[PDB]
Every structure is written in C-alpha cells, then in structure tokens.
Design a protein around this ligand. Structure first.
Ligand SMILES: Cc1cc2nc3c(=O)[nH]c(=O)nc-3n(C[C@H](O)[C@H](O)[C@H](O)COP(=O)(O)OP(=O)(O)OC[C@H]3O[C@@H](n4cnc5c(N)ncnc54)[C@H](O)[C@@H]3O)c2cc1C
Ligand SMILES: Cc1cc2nc3c(=O)[nH]c(=O)nc-3n(C[C@H](O)[C@H](O)[C@H](O)COP(=O)(O)OP(=O)(O)OC[C@H]3O[C@@H](n4cnc5c(N)ncnc54)[C@H](O)[C@@H]3O)c2cc1C
Lengths: 448, 434
C-alpha cells in the first residue's frame, strides 16, 4: 500500500494549516476532501457571506441618510452579487491545489472512513499513515421530522440563482439572523422560527434585545418557543408546521432553510473501527489535541471537542498546535487567547470574554457597565438607532473579563477589547489612552 | 476666581468641568459659541459630511457587482444634517457649565478680571496669508458652512485638511485643485504610503500641483485667478472659491503675551513638564495653544487638560505623559499612522526591522473593490515591539488604534501573531503585517 508521514481528513483551515506546515518540514503529506479544497469558511461560509453583506451595507447606509444627504436608496442586484461572490469561491480551490503541488502534497478527492487504527478507505485505496489528522469540521444537523429533507442548507443560501420571494430560517443563532438580514435587505419576506425562549441564547440578552428590535424594524417576523414538526410541498412553495405551548401555526414560504446547530462531521468516519474516543461534541482530545485513546490520531477545529469556539481562527490556532506535536513530538499544549465572535447582522453584534452571568458562575468579584447610547455622536452621525455596550471588569485586578457590543463597526472594535484582555491592560490605562477621533474605537474609554 | 480659562474648547471644557466638581470657583470665556474648533468648525462637522460621500464611494466600488445606481450627494440636506449637530452643541455646554456653578462669559500684566491661576486654551487660528489677495481665500470653517457647493474649488495646502476637503468636494461633483508649496504632499507621513493616496486622489479627478508658491489671488466677476510660481513658470488657476488650507498657527499672537512676561515661540506658549509656563508660574496652557510634545489632536487637547486641571487642583504633582498619538487623514481611502516613521526611528538610532507591502490583492481590499491597500510597520529588533505603523485602505481610522494599544502595552510581535481576531474583519490582517 501507500505509507504517509501525515494523512489529513479534510482540507479546511485546520487541514490546510497542518498540510502546508508539515509538508515544508519535509514530511510526506496525503490530504483528502469529499468536496473541493478550501473549507467551510472559504467556499460556503464566512468569505462568501461577507462579500454578499457588502452590497446590503451600501443599501443600509443610503437608507440611513435618506433625506439627510442621499436621495436614491440602491436596490441590491441579487444576480450580479452572486457572480461577484462566485469569482471568490471559484478561485480558492485551484489556489489551494497550486500550493499543494508546490509542496509535495498528494491530493485525494474522495470521502474517508477508518478501516483500522492506521488505515483509511480513500475511494478504492487503502492508505496507511504514521500520524492521521481529523479536520472534517462540522456538517448541517439532519432535521429528524416529517419533511426535514426539504430544508435547504447554509451552502444552498450562498448559491441561490434567484432570491426567493419569502424565506423561513429554522434556527435562532448567528446564521439565521445574518441570512434573515441579507434576504430582507435584498427585498424578500423573511421569518425566523426558533425553539427557544431567547434568540442567540449564548450572547448577553441586554445586547441581543437591540438586535431583535432592529430585526423587527427590517420586516423580519421572529417566531420564538416553536418546534417545527413538519414541512409539506404545497405547489412550488412549502407549508411549515410549528407547535408552541398549546397552539399550532402554519407558515408559507418559497424556500425553508436549516439554520440549526452544526454537529461535528465525525459520525461517518467509522471512528469505533480505530479505537478513537469521541462524544456528541466531536473527537475527544487531550491538552496536545491528541486523541485520548489512539495516539496516532490528532483533531483540530469544529471536528474536535476542544475549549475552542467554532471559529476560523481557532481552527488555525489548533492547526499550528497539532502540526507542532506531529513534526517535533508532544511538546506544545494548546493555549487560547480571547476568542472574539461577531454576528454579521446590521447593526453587527460582537462579544469577547465572559458574560455577566458566566463571570458570577465562576465567583469573580465584578463591575458591570451596561449602557444604551443611541444618542452618542457615532450612532447619530451614521443614523444607526441601536448602539449599546456591556463591559465586565474584575474588581480585584481592574482588568476586563469581557465586552459585548451592538452598533456601527463592533466587528472591528471588539478586537480592541480582545487585545486589552490578552495584555491585562488596567481599566485606567485604556481610559487615558489616545485614540484616533472621530472613530468608534474612541468610544471605548467611555464604556468603562 | 480660583481658575479663569480663555476658550471653551476641548481643553477649556475639560479643565473647567474637572475643577468645578472639586468645589473651586470657575470663570470661563470664549467669543464664539461654546464647543471649540473640533465640535463646531472641525472634526465633528467634517465627519458628518464625509458620511454621505462614503455612501456614494461604496455604491460605485460595487457598481456592476451588486449595485446598479450610484447616489448623488445632496449638498443642501447634509449641510442641514451637519448644522443640527453644530447648533445643538453650544446650548449643551451651557447646561453643563450652569449645572456646576461655572460663570459663562462670551467676550474675547502678570495676572490681569484677575484670578489666582489662569489657563490659555485658545487653540489655533487659520494662518493669515500675507500676499496680494490673501484675504479672498476662505477659512476651512467656511467650507463647512457653504450654502451651495461651488463648481470648482482650489486648496492652498499639502496637509490633512486640504486633502480631506478635496475628497469631499470631488465626490460631491466639483472640479478640484490642490496647490502645494512643498516637494511632497503630507510631508510628515511615510511617503511609501502617501503615494497610494496621491494615486487614488488623481483617479478621483483632482489636480495635485507640487513645488508651487501662491503669490496672488485676483477676483474677476464670480471667479478667482490664483497665480503660482515654480522653478520655471508662473502658471495661473481659475475657481469659484479658493480655500486657506495652509497650516494653523497657535491662537496667542493677539493676547499681548509680552504684557505678562509669558515665554512663547511661533509654535505656541512655551511650557515645562507640568504644562506651566517656563516664565510666569500663575499661567498654564493646553491644546493647539501650547508648544507641547503633543500632536495637534482633540484627544491630546483633553489629555493636556486633565494634567493642567490636576496641578491646579492639588498643586504641581503631575508631569504630562503622552501615550501613542494615532492620527488619521479622513480621505477615501483613509490614511492612518501612529508612532515613528522609518526615518524618525533611524534618527533616534533604534535598530529597526521594516515591513512594507502593497496588498490591493488581499480579500479585504478585493471584496470592497478598494484598489489602495498598503501598510508599513516599524519594529525595534531588540525588544521585538512595534515602534510605528502606517496604513492606507479600508477602516484604517479604526485599525490604527490596535497598533496604538500594541505600542502602549509593549506587546511582543509574536503575541500579536498568536492573537485571535474577529474574522472576516480588517483587524484580522494585522498579524500578516508584522
Ligand atoms: C455559513 C457559515 C458562516 C460562518 N461564518 C463564520 C464567520 O464569520 N467567522 C468565523 O470565524 N467562523 C465562521 N464560520 C465557522 C467557520 O467556517 C468554521 O469554524 C471553520 O471553517 C472550521 O474549519 P475546519 O477546518 O474545522 O472545517 P472546514 O474548514 O469546514 O473543513 C472541513 C473539510 O472537511 C471535509 N470533510 C468533512 N467530512 C469529511 C469526510 N468524512 N471525508 C473527507 N472530507 C471530509 C469538508 O468537505 C471540508 O472541506 C461559519 C460557518 C458557516 C457554516
Ligand atoms: C478642519 C479641522 C479638522 C480637524 N480634524 C481633526 C480630526 O479629525 N481629528 C482630530 O483629532 N483633530 C482634528 N482637528 C484638530 C482639533 O480641532 C483641535 O486639535 C482641537 O480643537 C483642540 O482643542 P483646543 O482646546 O486646543 O482648541 P479649540 O477648542 O479649537 O479652541 C477653543 C476656542 O478658543 C476660542 N478663542 C480663540 N481666541 C480666543 C480669545 N482671544 N479669547 C477667547 N476665546 C478665544 C476659539 O474661538 C475656539 O473656539 C481638526 C481641526 C480642524 C481645523
């Protein structure tokens, strides 16, 4: 058969990071992906989404200054932005292929299961390897209710030839809200059906409520405390059944979307046939991101049950660590800096570090600064109605435990709270800092 | 009075409000409405107007790529929008001053009303241009008060305001000229970066005239003819309005400084480490009015305020300390800098590593269809910390502050590389720049 130094399942951010890193320290590298090389982020995730959001920002901005110095609000041309998006998606796989060829990396284009501890079924073949890496990331949750198969994926949303006239999103996290915001701004009826009491349960609700507000003003119907129990095909539309505490509601839309959590993409690998430990949260890893059982097996990114948030940069960070323990031997212990996250709605919400309740749960002595500040210059000049913050400061050290933002540019500003946390910067050293002005960053000293 | 303050600017307001809260008697005077250059005739009103232009600019980068129509700026309606900001501010300063037992006065020897300690916070004024016809040239405040936009505009200058205003006017549909005396525009800034703003500014339909001294302005009908001499010719330039964009001397030359023995230069009131005058020790200065190590920025005016306020309140216990002072040119694309230029870090004999790159191909420049994206970082080799960073492209006005925090925190290069940033964002390009 073929022996390999490293064999990697999936050429995503974690797969690319290890493949490139190991191949340039001389090792023989075999990588396989069932889909074109790139990963969820580059082809069907963050990048394509952010491109699309581009044109909506133009529309949103023109709308905000209407009759305040702008007369015509542009309508988004759905056709042209998909093509623009596509030029980014189409270029990335050949770009990762070009690099794999220039690095002595064997490209395989087939799915992968374990046959044994150190062997894999790649199409027909039977590739053994010295160290094997699981970097499969996560997949859409299979909806286990009558009609579940009618619910299109996130990938399908980003590949729409035409924008449907109405869209329902089954979910209550970041994807449901980002895709609702895009759909509505491009001129469709949108509904969001979420099973929980609170949308974006993970985020500080004193921030989330302002996003719910903006989301209603946009013409997006938020349905809470509802389990979808069916999807039926009524002509070329869909009739969605939802059950709440007593009553039953039906909802019609030209397209229904699966916006649920994403389980780790590890359940079809025949893990058990290789003695590899796993949970419902993904591949079980130790402090070296080495499997807790089979020590030839490493995992990184969404496919690993780590303390890492399911974020592109985390997948890279975990990538550098796995590749290091492979190339040199188990020396490096994974260390997480702050993990800032963004919901790419307009207005954006951003969060880094602990929530109020999380910091109390950990018995930290805290100070809380929450403030709605829509009347601050930065919100008023851009005519953005929702601007609010919540900062969590440790009373003992006078450092930041966490920051939670909604308003203009929070996706950027959240990174200054990230750096303040990582550098253990005292609250008074941020207050007396000089920022460029007028800028959103320059409001940070007023948030403390 | 305990404290008497000349000018309710950012420095004036800061010292006034700070002293008044500790139980001191406070007297302040301006001459114009209370607020200062930034709030009423500077940064604030300028940023409001730039908003409308960002819409037009953005709806045009994505022209044919998801946007079909490019909106025209309504000069009247954004003036009105700008004016609502400016008009509501001075009554808001009264409400603060009155709610703290501060005496408001609205008029222009050693300590002559007399008071125990006196503060000079007069800020800066437009340079009086002293050539035949200099008076025709309107102030930058007048640009921000224009009822109507002229059809052509000429800017005498090579600094941030000349370019910021040229960008606005061009985007609003006007033929625009910059006449600069110097060899290079924006001389203080890294030229490896400035050259990219030059490129974009010409692509905008702006004529940049270099190495030219303006010798006259002549007013024929509702036009003006500007005369300009180089090493060769005396080229002439015609425009419905000419603007004074030349540099702002400190606003102290008409206060009769010599009548109080108070040290000054042409660069402003001479101050010590306490921001107390090097001669008269009853006199403190803050802002554009002080010849301090502080750049002429709003936040510097505030920082200098809090030091003067503290030395006055408890006695001379605090020596002014400057953090990194990031500055921005609010053109599109924006230009940003903080800390040392390459040549300045060499002048202080730092052993330096320099990272430059033009990166208009990177995802963040490419997805926004911004052609100009470049950076230049200056790293001290010994400590592996950032001495300076210099940026042009999308969001540099926001991103430059991360370089500021990195410098203040003596953050090692490798810890910026290992940081996790929100993605996709402009901030997440920082570790690639390093
Ligand atoms: C719509 C969407 C938007 C997102 N937006 C953001 C955002 O803005 N910011 C952010 O930080 N994160 C975002 N994320 C998350 C981000 O995409 C992931 O955290 C990151 O891409 C995980 O990368 P990975 O390397 O772990 O997996 P991926 O990068 O997805 O790579 C896994 C690869 O494995 C392949 N594969 C899977 N199973 C097998 C198998 N059995 N055999 C062979 N190949 C297999 C897949 O085809 C895929 O190419 C988003 C995700 C989605 C879905
Ligand atoms: C067009 C422009 C754009 C700018 N943009 C920016 C920017 O984007 N970012 C930034 O950080 N900085 C910017 N600045 C700089 C900023 O305006 C100043 O640094 C800031 O105003 C400093 O405040 P100050 O207290 O020193 O002066 P000011 O607040 O300007 O001065 C206070 C007041 O003193 C008054 N005064 C003058 N003489 C007398 C007198 N004899 N008696 C009584 N009162 C008097 C004046 O009327 C003035 O209103 C800009 C400046 C201009 C002109």
């Amino acid at each position: 058969m073929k022996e390999y130094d490293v064999f990697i399942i999936g050429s995503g951010m974690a797969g690319m990071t290890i493949a490139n890193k190991c191949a340039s320290k001389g090792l023989t590298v075999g990588i396989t992906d069932e889909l074109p090389y790139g990963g969820t982020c580059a082809l069907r995730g963050c990048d394509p989404k952010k491109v699309i959001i581009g044109a909506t920002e133009v529309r949103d901005f023109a709308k905000r200054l209407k009759g305040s110095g702008i007369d015509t609000i542009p309508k988004v041309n759905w056709k042209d932005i998909m093509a623009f998006k596509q030029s980014f998606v189409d270029e990335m796989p050949p770009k990762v292929e070009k690099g794999y060829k220039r690095n002595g990396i064997d490209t395989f284009h087939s799915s992968a299961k374990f046959l044994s501890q150190n062997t894999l079924e790649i199409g027909n073949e039977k590739i053994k390897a010295k160290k094997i890496v699981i970097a499969s990331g996560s997949k859409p949750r299979v909806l286990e209710f009558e009609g579940g198969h009618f619910a299109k994926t996130s990938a399908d949303f980003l590949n729409l030839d035409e924008l449907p006239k109405s869209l329902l999103f089954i979910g209550g996290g970041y994807i449901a809200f980002e895709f609702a915001h895009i759909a509505a701004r491009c001129g469709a009826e949108v509904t969001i059906v979420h099973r929980g009491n609170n949308p974006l349960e993970n985020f500080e609700q004193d921030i989330v409520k302002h996003l719910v507000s903006a989301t209603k003003k946009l013409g997006v119907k938020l349905i809470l405390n509802t389990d979808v129990t069916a999807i039926e095909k009524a002509d070329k539309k869909f009739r969605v059944k939802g059950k709440s505490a007593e009553k039953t509601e039906y909802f019609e839309a030209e397209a229904v979307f699966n916006s649920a959590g994403r389980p780790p993409a590890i359940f079809d690998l025949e893990l058990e046939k290789a003695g590899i430990s796993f949970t419902k949260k993904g591949v079980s890893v130790n402090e070296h991101l080495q499997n807790t059982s089979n020590p030839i097996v490493y995992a990184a990114g969404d496919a690993a049950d780590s303390e890492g948030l399911p974020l592109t940069p985390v997948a890279v960070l975990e990538g550098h660590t796995v590749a290091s323990n492979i190339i040199k031997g188990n020396h490096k212990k994974i260390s997480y800096p702050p993990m800032p996250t963004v919901v790419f709605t307009l207005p954006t919400m951003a969060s880094v570090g602990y929530t109020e309740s999380r910091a109390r749960e950990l018995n930290y002595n805290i100070q809380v600064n929450y403030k709605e500040v829509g009347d601050w210059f930065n919100a008023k000049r851009l005519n953005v109605a929702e601007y609010a913050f919540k900062t969590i400061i440790d009373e003992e050290t006078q450092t930041i435990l966490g920051a939670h933002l909604i308003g203009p540019h929070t996706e950027e500003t959240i990174n200054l709270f990230a750096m303040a946390i990582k550098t253990k910067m005292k609250v008074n050293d941020i207050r007396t800092m000089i920022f460029s002005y007028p800028t959103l960053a320059s409001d940070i000293p007023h948030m403390l």
